[PDB]
Amino acid sequence: DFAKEIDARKKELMELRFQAAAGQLAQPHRVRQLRREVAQLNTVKAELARKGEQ
């Protein structure tokens, strides 16, 4: 399911990128926030790798 959680931020980042290429990018911060949420969402995966499996 974590891939499902990731690609939603991906698609919003894509359509938001399109909007930036056009005439409307009124909240630039929503960009890097979404990128944050991807990094976090992957970093958490790393913590379930070594945990449990040892």
């Binding site: 690609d7 991906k10 698609k11 980042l13 894509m14 990128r17 399109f18 930036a20 290429a21 056009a22």
Partner: protein, 92 residues
């Protein structure tokens, strides 16, 4: 995956007249190929692709501040769909 292969739509008076033909034009990450670029377009927008063409494009060599500049480097791809010619309608 597919979302971040697509770069940003071309905004060109030529590209927008092609918008009226069912033709769609947008930049992509240059190291991608046609096969994956097509399944990306059609995973994303839900539409059959019947025609792809692609072209590497050098970055223009602009100069700011009297420090000589560099290139930028892109790969515009043009695509023709089936008769189901919709995208998001977001054309203008």
């Amino acid at each position: 995956s597919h979302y971040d292969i697509l770069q940003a739509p071309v905004i060109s008076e030529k590209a927008y007249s092609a918008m009226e033909r069912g033709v769609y034009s947008f930049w992509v990450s240059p190291k991608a190929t046609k096969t994956e670029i097509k399944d990306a377009i059609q995973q994303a927008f839900g539409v059959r692709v019947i025609g792809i063409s692609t072209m590497n494009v050098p970055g223009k060599r602009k100069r700011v501040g009297r420090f000589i500049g560099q290139r930028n480097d892109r790969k515009k791809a043009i695509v023709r769909l089936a008769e189901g010619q919709s995208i998001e309608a977001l054309a203008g």
